[PDB]
Amino acid sequence: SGFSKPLHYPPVRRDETVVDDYFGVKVADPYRWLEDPNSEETKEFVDNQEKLANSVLEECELIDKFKQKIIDFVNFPRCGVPFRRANKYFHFYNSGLQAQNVFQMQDDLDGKPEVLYDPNLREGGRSGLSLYSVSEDAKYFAFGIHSGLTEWVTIKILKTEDRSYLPDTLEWVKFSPAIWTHDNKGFFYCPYPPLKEGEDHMTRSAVNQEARYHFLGTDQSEDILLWRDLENPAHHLKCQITDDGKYFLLYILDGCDDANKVYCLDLTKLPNGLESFSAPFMKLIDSFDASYTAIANDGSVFTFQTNKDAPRKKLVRVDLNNPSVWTDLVPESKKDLLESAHAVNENQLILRYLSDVKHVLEIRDLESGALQHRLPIDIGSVDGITARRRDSVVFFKFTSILTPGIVYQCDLKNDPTQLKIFRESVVPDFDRSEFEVKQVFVPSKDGTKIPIFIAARKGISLDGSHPCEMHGYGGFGINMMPTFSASRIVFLKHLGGVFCLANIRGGGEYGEEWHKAGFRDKKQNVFDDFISAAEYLISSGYTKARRVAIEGGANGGLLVAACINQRPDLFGCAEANCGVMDMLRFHKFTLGYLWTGDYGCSDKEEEFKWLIKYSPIHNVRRPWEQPGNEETQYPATMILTADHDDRVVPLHSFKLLATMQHVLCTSLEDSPQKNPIIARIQRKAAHYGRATMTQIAEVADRYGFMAKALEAPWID
Amino acid sequence: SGFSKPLHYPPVRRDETVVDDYFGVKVADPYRWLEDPNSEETKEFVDNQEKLANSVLEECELIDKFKQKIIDFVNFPRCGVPFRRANKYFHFYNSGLQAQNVFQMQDDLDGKPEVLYDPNLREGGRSGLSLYSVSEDAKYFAFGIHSGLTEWVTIKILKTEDRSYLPDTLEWVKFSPAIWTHDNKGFFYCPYPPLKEGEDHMTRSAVNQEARYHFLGTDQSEDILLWRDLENPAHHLKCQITDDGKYFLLYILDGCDDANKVYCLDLTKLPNGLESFSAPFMKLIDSFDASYTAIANDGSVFTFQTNKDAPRKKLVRVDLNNPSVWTDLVPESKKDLLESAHAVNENQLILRYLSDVKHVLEIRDLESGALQHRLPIDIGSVDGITARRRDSVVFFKFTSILTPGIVYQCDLKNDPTQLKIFRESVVPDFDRSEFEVKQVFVPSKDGTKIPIFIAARKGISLDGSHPCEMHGYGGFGINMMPTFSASRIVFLKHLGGVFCLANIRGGGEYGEEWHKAGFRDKKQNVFDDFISAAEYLISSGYTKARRVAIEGGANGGLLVAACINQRPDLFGCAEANCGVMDMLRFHKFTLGYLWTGDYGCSDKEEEFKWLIKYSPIHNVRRPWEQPGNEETQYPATMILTADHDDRVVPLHSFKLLATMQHVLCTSLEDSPQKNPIIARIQRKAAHYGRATMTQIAEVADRYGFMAKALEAPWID
Amino acid sequence: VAWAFQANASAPV
Amino acid sequence: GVAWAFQANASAPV
Ligand SMILES: [Mg+2]
Ligand SMILES: [Mg+2]
């Protein structure tokens, strides 16, 4: 059976004087001190919770078996999607179990690879490459490393011919690319201001993002300033250069929304080519009404992807010399989301459509916009189309729940109809034919039909006897695709599991209407959709309440935490990874202020009223005190986080853990809460980008805990 | 501290009626039934011992930490020694953690490799290649796979140009190579007769080995018979073809000795090819007086390595047209063993000498025999010289306790003096400079000096406080060299260990006199040498009796078992891997009759009298019943074996385990034997050639058990 | 890429 | 020799 050994919950101090007023409503915050990650009391908290977590995980006798089977199932070589610059080709490679992927160069696609940068030689591959950019002549490689424990990036540059490093060093980058000019003299990039003397990446909320240009062979202090806006500190940036080299495009965003400005700088009409300097941008779009991504241009005639009067998106054309005259090229599909578009083979387009959460590729003529070929893809995901307009061969990656990884090739000149296999990964000692994945539509609370994928062994009896894992996200217009996971295969084969992915509202799967039906005032719909999916898996006979585990990350951690507060009776195991748990204060820390488009903000009264109803730390309640449900407790709960997660600050997880342990366990002398409530806190790690063995260790602990919580035996 | 939980030893049936007479001496064999591996009672025994082993290994809390550190330390790429055929080059490769090595082809040494055979794509790499042979034109690759669970081999053939398989299939091979004729039409090989309908590789003693020739494009039934000897069923075979293609050489051996016949077949004087057919061999040597290996020939003038009147070996020359006139070319060294010789660069020789258990390479002129250059090698091992007479570049492999693997290159024309690094393996995150290896010469019981290597952290105090692992073999003329082991590095760094390798008698290290001083009537010398090495490590202050572990495999498993029967007081942990434990009956099973050269045989009265004094299963005795040593027990003992080990049948291990558990534990109502006596039985595996992760799992269990037995804590 | 979301990952664990 | 009570292209130097 499950957990029997008694639990020594550690003491956690409460400061009872901390109370905040939100428009007349008082809210106590007695774990306010856990907001400081560098204090002695917080470091002691982490030590005590590690100790508790270790004694619980010692009781989970299947961790070692999961660990070895994950290692075995992921031990296959993985070739990344290749891209071209000049007459060289470039790709990422991993021989199967390397700590981080290696970046390689070739003369032709079937030639000997040469290693350009191997992260495994630095600090055991604790961190990998988060930025990688090759110049137009293929002579230089700009690469982004992690100098500290946070996700902040330092940019270095090397010569491809001998791998010698230049001395250039650029600090203060997060998500920016490095965008080379066709003269090969430098690149655009978009940094934040420097840290001042006292400051720390874990406690500073960075603002005032900049657009800069760096000349090769200079100090970062000489980089040219192109754009800043001190009167709108929260406005953030992305950028791009056109395939012909003529135009630098700056996109300006506000919050999480899919709505951006478009500023264009004509590089061919500068008197002193960027040393002249804000710059004289043509402001094509100067408001936050719609999304705009440049796909191609011939001179000043541009082709954009846009959601303007088009919730499922479309392609449109406009001349910069006549800026107010926009014309449709490929109209909005009546059914399906246009996810992305790419110019190829000089005068053609590849369009990626999402049709009931499956991809469909269309080949089209660029000038006229007419359909040429249509290729439906199997259940899974196509992504990573990086080919540029000058290339006649297009590459992309395919993954699915039961398909580890294929790199496909579409030669547009020689045979544009079908797809050929360039590379194909294989899972060792795994018979794919014994399992199946199906889509079903389940009615939510309000009647809306929610698509879900269900993966399972073929021919099982729907008798309620199977352990079930359900995954979801539901936010920011993100499309949740059934991709490959090695640990999920171990769950299916060796624990007899049923896996479910729920395409709940708040994602982008049916366009902008799907996103808006699960954000701001309608965030509760997201939780209702997830709860309804779990109720369907029970009523149809896949599983029962004791045997359901739910998991999710970040906005998906919020999902898990809210669902266990509202319907603890439905679940046997809950795993929240790096979740947003204090919805009253999230906007104050690091770049959390960028989530106010989706969540709203407690600075405003009507938005506070949404947030207080579901904020995880403000809604923990003893389920046994509600008349009728005296035999209900919280499921076995694992809260996961990392000590230098600057994306989602670990105070979110720390404060929830303390509130749960207090309300349910330590505030009562003889609690009915038997199931364990623990945290697994990864030391010296950030949100993402961890070494292979470090991530395997986290995942094996999660699944061992799950198996114990659900009372699921191992199957050889 | 160490083992505290009592063990629930399972019941094991005794058949008290089984008694054998050996020249008037009665020997009871009450576990005779464990000689059948396919019976239900034997399968139950295995199940019960697995269960007992699991509960003991659950108490050993360092197994998981050892397992992860072994995986991490062995995760580096390994390039094999390349060899040449026509204008192609061939080698084995492993990217670090692949289950089995992959065989690759190249056009040039720095060109792109092409995979010819990948064992990892068949049954998860349960088994690898045990035979690999490329034809003279480089167009065909003959390769040996394991179709069952034993080590028996099936030979298949593929075309190198497209990797298409030929239909040809050859069964019934063990250790034979595949030796191609220069016409590219076929190859010589030396199989055993087929299994009959009832028979099983685990219970049949194969005899009547044959020399055959296989034509490409025919069934195995058409293969030409060249040699068989029905009146000497035990005589076994090796074979070779000369560099010029002229002569097929058949070597005939009797038992394990280093003494062989030499039969020569002139291929250029056959009327009708090999289809003419025993064959008309010239019987150059027709007795078992000495060892003879052909190194080179010019027409009928041959150059042999031999131990004839030369226990340290030498090179000699003879003309087949005048067969009785032998002349020395390189005389026997007064000090050092000539281990091997190789013809290179048309008119030169590389000679490999062993000088106090360190290799020395000499370059010599072939015709005159005169010394040209001399290259001393560091502590470690040079081997794998496969270059042929026509090659001007020689490759070989170097390994040491602290050096994972270098492939060296010696260009004889351009610069014959020094060695260049072709490939060099590196252990990730391991500082080599913190450790050292030293050689010391220790007196045995009779005065003979025994070389031992001692590996340890630099600057440790000789205060008796360190855990110590000692390894040895001592048999069959085998030279034990200090090679690289990843698990041994974990022992040194993370358990603060001292490793010792003892070059005891019965090996070949000081020539044939060293072998003969530890075989047949003098086998006890081998055990005495090992015991004296452990006594030196104690008296000099490296360790003490509680803190010494001993390990060995096969003939080395015998070593361990005999030493614990005779001096149980010296050791804290004993690990015997696939050991020969019934010295009265070993000759009856599979190819165990080939060990009678070294051991003698119980069919003969004086030889039985040697064997009964040390046979492990016949010499288990309660040490506490001898007056004076009432506080002595057997050390914590792990007996390792595999269920399809057809080399050393697992009945050896099963019978010892049962005898030890009976005599020391279950035959007494309140035994002083507290230390555990268990078996770790690997399911679905043979003697050797197991997948990387399967072997890592065995080795992590061994070391976790050792750490517990010796009371050694982990060091971060 | 700037959202509460975890996505050149070393392995599909 | 290959045929002895002996354990020796091993996949890895474990
Ligand atoms: Mg810090
Ligand atoms: Mg069998």
mmCIF file with all atom_site columns, N, CA and C in Angstrom, chain B residues 3 5-7 9 564 568 572 620-624 630-637 660-666 668 670-678:
data_model
loop_
_atom_site.group_PDB
_atom_site.id
_atom_site.type_symbol
_atom_site.label_atom_id
_atom_site.label_alt_id
_atom_site.label_comp_id
_atom_site.label_asym_id
_atom_site.label_entity_id
_atom_site.label_seq_id
_atom_site.pdbx_PDB_ins_code
_atom_site.Cartn_x
_atom_site.Cartn_y
_atom_site.Cartn_z
_atom_site.occupancy
_atom_site.B_iso_or_equiv
_atom_site.pdbx_formal_charge
_atom_site.auth_seq_id
_atom_site.auth_comp_id
_atom_site.auth_asym_id
_atom_site.auth_atom_id
_atom_site.pdbx_PDB_model_num
ATOM 1   N N  . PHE B 1 3   ? 26.627 -5.059  8.610  1.00 0.00 ? 3   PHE B N  1
ATOM 2   C CA . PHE B 1 3   ? 25.384 -5.833  8.551  1.00 0.00 ? 3   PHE B CA 1
ATOM 3   C C  . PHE B 1 3   ? 24.856 -6.153  9.946  1.00 0.00 ? 3   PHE B C  1
ATOM 4   N N  . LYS B 1 5   ? 20.989 -6.742  10.370 1.00 0.00 ? 5   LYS B N  1
ATOM 5   C CA . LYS B 1 5   ? 19.739 -7.511  10.267 1.00 0.00 ? 5   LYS B CA 1
ATOM 6   C C  . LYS B 1 5   ? 20.061 -8.995  10.046 1.00 0.00 ? 5   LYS B C  1
ATOM 7   N N  . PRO B 1 6   ? 19.437 -9.913  10.831 1.00 0.00 ? 6   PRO B N  1
ATOM 8   C CA . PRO B 1 6   ? 19.617 -11.346 10.524 1.00 0.00 ? 6   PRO B CA 1
ATOM 9   C C  . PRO B 1 6   ? 19.021 -11.735 9.157  1.00 0.00 ? 6   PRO B C  1
ATOM 10  N N  . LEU B 1 7   ? 19.564 -12.802 8.579  1.00 0.00 ? 7   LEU B N  1
ATOM 11  C CA . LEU B 1 7   ? 19.136 -13.316 7.295  1.00 0.00 ? 7   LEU B CA 1
ATOM 12  C C  . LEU B 1 7   ? 18.217 -14.543 7.437  1.00 0.00 ? 7   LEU B C  1
ATOM 13  N N  . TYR B 1 9   ? 17.614 -17.538 5.760  1.00 0.00 ? 9   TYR B N  1
ATOM 14  C CA . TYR B 1 9   ? 18.213 -18.425 4.768  1.00 0.00 ? 9   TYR B CA 1
ATOM 15  C C  . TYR B 1 9   ? 17.151 -19.435 4.308  1.00 0.00 ? 9   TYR B C  1
ATOM 16  N N  . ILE B 1 564 ? 39.522 -17.802 1.211  1.00 0.00 ? 564 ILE B N  1
ATOM 17  C CA . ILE B 1 564 ? 38.575 -17.650 2.337  1.00 0.00 ? 564 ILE B CA 1
ATOM 18  C C  . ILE B 1 564 ? 38.371 -18.947 3.142  1.00 0.00 ? 564 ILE B C  1
ATOM 19  N N  . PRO B 1 568 ? 40.149 -17.274 6.486  1.00 0.00 ? 568 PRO B N  1
ATOM 20  C CA . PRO B 1 568 ? 38.967 -16.396 6.619  1.00 0.00 ? 568 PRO B CA 1
ATOM 21  C C  . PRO B 1 568 ? 39.191 -15.184 7.538  1.00 0.00 ? 568 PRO B C  1
ATOM 22  N N  . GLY B 1 572 ? 37.597 -9.021  5.112  1.00 0.00 ? 572 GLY B N  1
ATOM 23  C CA . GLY B 1 572 ? 36.301 -8.466  5.490  1.00 0.00 ? 572 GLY B CA 1
ATOM 24  C C  . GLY B 1 572 ? 35.231 -8.633  4.428  1.00 0.00 ? 572 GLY B C  1
ATOM 25  N N  . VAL B 1 620 ? 34.928 -26.375 3.000  1.00 0.00 ? 620 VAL B N  1
ATOM 26  C CA . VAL B 1 620 ? 34.223 -25.408 3.853  1.00 0.00 ? 620 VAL B CA 1
ATOM 27  C C  . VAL B 1 620 ? 34.177 -25.984 5.269  1.00 0.00 ? 620 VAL B C  1
ATOM 28  N N  . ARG B 1 621 ? 34.724 -25.236 6.229  1.00 0.00 ? 621 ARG B N  1
ATOM 29  C CA . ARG B 1 621 ? 34.797 -25.659 7.627  1.00 0.00 ? 621 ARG B CA 1
ATOM 30  C C  . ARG B 1 621 ? 34.571 -24.477 8.566  1.00 0.00 ? 621 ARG B C  1
ATOM 31  N N  . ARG B 1 622 ? 33.914 -24.741 9.694  1.00 0.00 ? 622 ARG B N  1
ATOM 32  C CA . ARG B 1 622 ? 33.609 -23.719 10.696 1.00 0.00 ? 622 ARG B CA 1
ATOM 33  C C  . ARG B 1 622 ? 34.909 -23.252 11.365 1.00 0.00 ? 622 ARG B C  1
ATOM 34  N N  . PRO B 1 623 ? 35.358 -22.001 11.106 1.00 0.00 ? 623 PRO B N  1
ATOM 35  C CA . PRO B 1 623 ? 36.641 -21.571 11.679 1.00 0.00 ? 623 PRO B CA 1
ATOM 36  C C  . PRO B 1 623 ? 36.671 -21.488 13.212 1.00 0.00 ? 623 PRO B C  1
ATOM 37  N N  . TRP B 1 624 ? 35.524 -21.199 13.830 1.00 0.00 ? 624 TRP B N  1
ATOM 38  C CA . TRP B 1 624 ? 35.397 -21.103 15.299 1.00 0.00 ? 624 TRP B CA 1
ATOM 39  C C  . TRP B 1 624 ? 35.551 -22.424 16.063 1.00 0.00 ? 624 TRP B C  1
ATOM 40  N N  . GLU B 1 630 ? 38.260 -18.800 18.132 1.00 0.00 ? 630 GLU B N  1
ATOM 41  C CA . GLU B 1 630 ? 36.823 -18.876 18.439 1.00 0.00 ? 630 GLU B CA 1
ATOM 42  C C  . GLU B 1 630 ? 36.041 -17.629 17.981 1.00 0.00 ? 630 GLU B C  1
ATOM 43  N N  . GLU B 1 631 ? 36.729 -16.495 17.833 1.00 0.00 ? 631 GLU B N  1
ATOM 44  C CA . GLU B 1 631 ? 36.112 -15.233 17.378 1.00 0.00 ? 631 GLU B CA 1
ATOM 45  C C  . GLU B 1 631 ? 36.230 -14.984 15.853 1.00 0.00 ? 631 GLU B C  1
ATOM 46  N N  . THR B 1 632 ? 36.615 -16.011 15.086 1.00 0.00 ? 632 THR B N  1
ATOM 47  C CA . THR B 1 632 ? 36.730 -15.918 13.633 1.00 0.00 ? 632 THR B CA 1
ATOM 48  C C  . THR B 1 632 ? 35.482 -16.481 12.951 1.00 0.00 ? 632 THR B C  1
ATOM 49  N N  . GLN B 1 633 ? 35.029 -15.769 11.920 1.00 0.00 ? 633 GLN B N  1
ATOM 50  C CA . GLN B 1 633 ? 33.962 -16.220 11.029 1.00 0.00 ? 633 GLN B CA 1
ATOM 51  C C  . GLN B 1 633 ? 34.394 -15.961 9.595  1.00 0.00 ? 633 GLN B C  1
ATOM 52  N N  . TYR B 1 634 ? 33.625 -16.486 8.642  1.00 0.00 ? 634 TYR B N  1
ATOM 53  C CA . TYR B 1 634 ? 33.846 -16.159 7.232  1.00 0.00 ? 634 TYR B CA 1
ATOM 54  C C  . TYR B 1 634 ? 33.517 -14.680 6.984  1.00 0.00 ? 634 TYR B C  1
ATOM 55  N N  . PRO B 1 635 ? 34.259 -14.026 6.063  1.00 0.00 ? 635 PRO B N  1
ATOM 56  C CA . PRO B 1 635 ? 33.898 -12.654 5.696  1.00 0.00 ? 635 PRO B CA 1
ATOM 57  C C  . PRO B 1 635 ? 32.539 -12.630 5.008  1.00 0.00 ? 635 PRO B C  1
ATOM 58  N N  . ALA B 1 636 ? 31.942 -11.440 4.924  1.00 0.00 ? 636 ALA B N  1
ATOM 59  C CA . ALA B 1 636 ? 30.762 -11.223 4.082  1.00 0.00 ? 636 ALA B CA 1
ATOM 60  C C  . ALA B 1 636 ? 31.120 -11.640 2.660  1.00 0.00 ? 636 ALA B C  1
ATOM 61  N N  . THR B 1 637 ? 30.356 -12.573 2.100  1.00 0.00 ? 637 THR B N  1
ATOM 62  C CA . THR B 1 637 ? 30.683 -13.218 0.834  1.00 0.00 ? 637 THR B CA 1
ATOM 63  C C  . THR B 1 637 ? 29.534 -13.055 -0.187 1.00 0.00 ? 637 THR B C  1
ATOM 64  N N  . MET B 1 660 ? 28.177 -23.651 1.722  1.00 0.00 ? 660 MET B N  1
ATOM 65  C CA . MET B 1 660 ? 28.520 -22.593 2.680  1.00 0.00 ? 660 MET B CA 1
ATOM 66  C C  . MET B 1 660 ? 27.356 -22.261 3.609  1.00 0.00 ? 660 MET B C  1
ATOM 67  N N  . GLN B 1 661 ? 26.168 -22.073 3.034  1.00 0.00 ? 661 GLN B N  1
ATOM 68  C CA . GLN B 1 661 ? 24.973 -21.784 3.835  1.00 0.00 ? 661 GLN B CA 1
ATOM 69  C C  . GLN B 1 661 ? 24.664 -22.946 4.800  1.00 0.00 ? 661 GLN B C  1
ATOM 70  N N  . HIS B 1 662 ? 24.835 -24.187 4.336  1.00 0.00 ? 662 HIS B N  1
ATOM 71  C CA . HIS B 1 662 ? 24.607 -25.370 5.185  1.00 0.00 ? 662 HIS B CA 1
ATOM 72  C C  . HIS B 1 662 ? 25.616 -25.460 6.323  1.00 0.00 ? 662 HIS B C  1
ATOM 73  N N  . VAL B 1 663 ? 26.893 -25.583 5.969  1.00 0.00 ? 663 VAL B N  1
ATOM 74  C CA . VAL B 1 663 ? 27.957 -25.812 6.959  1.00 0.00 ? 663 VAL B CA 1
ATOM 75  C C  . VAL B 1 663 ? 28.038 -24.680 7.994  1.00 0.00 ? 663 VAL B C  1
ATOM 76  N N  . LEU B 1 664 ? 27.961 -23.434 7.538  1.00 0.00 ? 664 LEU B N  1
ATOM 77  C CA . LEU B 1 664 ? 28.168 -22.271 8.407  1.00 0.00 ? 664 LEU B CA 1
ATOM 78  C C  . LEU B 1 664 ? 26.912 -21.695 9.071  1.00 0.00 ? 664 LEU B C  1
ATOM 79  N N  . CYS B 1 665 ? 25.730 -21.868 8.464  1.00 0.00 ? 665 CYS B N  1
ATOM 80  C CA . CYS B 1 665 ? 24.498 -21.184 8.929  1.00 0.00 ? 665 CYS B CA 1
ATOM 81  C C  . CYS B 1 665 ? 23.312 -22.089 9.319  1.00 0.00 ? 665 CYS B C  1
ATOM 82  N N  . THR B 1 666 ? 22.804 -22.905 8.394  1.00 0.00 ? 666 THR B N  1
ATOM 83  C CA . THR B 1 666 ? 21.561 -23.664 8.643  1.00 0.00 ? 666 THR B CA 1
ATOM 84  C C  . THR B 1 666 ? 21.736 -24.998 9.401  1.00 0.00 ? 666 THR B C  1
ATOM 85  N N  . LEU B 1 668 ? 23.392 -25.384 12.191 1.00 0.00 ? 668 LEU B N  1
ATOM 86  C CA . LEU B 1 668 ? 23.530 -25.047 13.615 1.00 0.00 ? 668 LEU B CA 1
ATOM 87  C C  . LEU B 1 668 ? 22.366 -24.189 14.076 1.00 0.00 ? 668 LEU B C  1
ATOM 88  N N  . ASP B 1 670 ? 22.281 -21.853 16.493 1.00 0.00 ? 670 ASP B N  1
ATOM 89  C CA . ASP B 1 670 ? 22.590 -20.481 16.905 1.00 0.00 ? 670 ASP B CA 1
ATOM 90  C C  . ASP B 1 670 ? 24.006 -20.098 16.465 1.00 0.00 ? 670 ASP B C  1
ATOM 91  N N  . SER B 1 671 ? 24.176 -19.937 15.156 1.00 0.00 ? 671 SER B N  1
ATOM 92  C CA . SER B 1 671 ? 25.500 -19.816 14.548 1.00 0.00 ? 671 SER B CA 1
ATOM 93  C C  . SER B 1 671 ? 26.239 -18.512 14.895 1.00 0.00 ? 671 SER B C  1
ATOM 94  N N  . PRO B 1 672 ? 27.558 -18.602 15.160 1.00 0.00 ? 672 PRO B N  1
ATOM 95  C CA . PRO B 1 672 ? 28.381 -17.390 15.251 1.00 0.00 ? 672 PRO B CA 1
ATOM 96  C C  . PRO B 1 672 ? 28.605 -16.668 13.918 1.00 0.00 ? 672 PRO B C  1
ATOM 97  N N  . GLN B 1 673 ? 28.320 -17.330 12.791 1.00 0.00 ? 673 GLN B N  1
ATOM 98  C CA . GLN B 1 673 ? 28.369 -16.698 11.463 1.00 0.00 ? 673 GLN B CA 1
ATOM 99  C C  . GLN B 1 673 ? 27.267 -15.633 11.310 1.00 0.00 ? 673 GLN B C  1
ATOM 100 N N  . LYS B 1 674 ? 27.644 -14.371 11.511 1.00 0.00 ? 674 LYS B N  1
ATOM 101 C CA . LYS B 1 674 ? 26.745 -13.217 11.371 1.00 0.00 ? 674 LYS B CA 1
ATOM 102 C C  . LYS B 1 674 ? 26.832 -12.589 9.978  1.00 0.00 ? 674 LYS B C  1
ATOM 103 N N  . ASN B 1 675 ? 28.044 -12.487 9.416  1.00 0.00 ? 675 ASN B N  1
ATOM 104 C CA . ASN B 1 675 ? 28.229 -11.893 8.085  1.00 0.00 ? 675 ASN B CA 1
ATOM 105 C C  . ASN B 1 675 ? 27.434 -12.669 7.014  1.00 0.00 ? 675 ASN B C  1
ATOM 106 N N  . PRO B 1 676 ? 26.809 -11.950 6.055  1.00 0.00 ? 676 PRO B N  1
ATOM 107 C CA . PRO B 1 676 ? 25.940 -12.604 5.070  1.00 0.00 ? 676 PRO B CA 1
ATOM 108 C C  . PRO B 1 676 ? 26.696 -13.395 3.990  1.00 0.00 ? 676 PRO B C  1
ATOM 109 N N  . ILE B 1 677 ? 26.088 -14.506 3.573  1.00 0.00 ? 677 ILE B N  1
ATOM 110 C CA . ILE B 1 677 ? 26.580 -15.355 2.499  1.00 0.00 ? 677 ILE B CA 1
ATOM 111 C C  . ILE B 1 677 ? 25.466 -15.460 1.444  1.00 0.00 ? 677 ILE B C  1
ATOM 112 N N  . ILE B 1 678 ? 25.637 -14.744 0.330  1.00 0.00 ? 678 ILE B N  1
ATOM 113 C CA . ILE B 1 678 ? 24.611 -14.601 -0.706 1.00 0.00 ? 678 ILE B CA 1
ATOM 114 C C  . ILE B 1 678 ? 25.177 -14.824 -2.097 1.00 0.00 ? 678 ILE B C  1
#
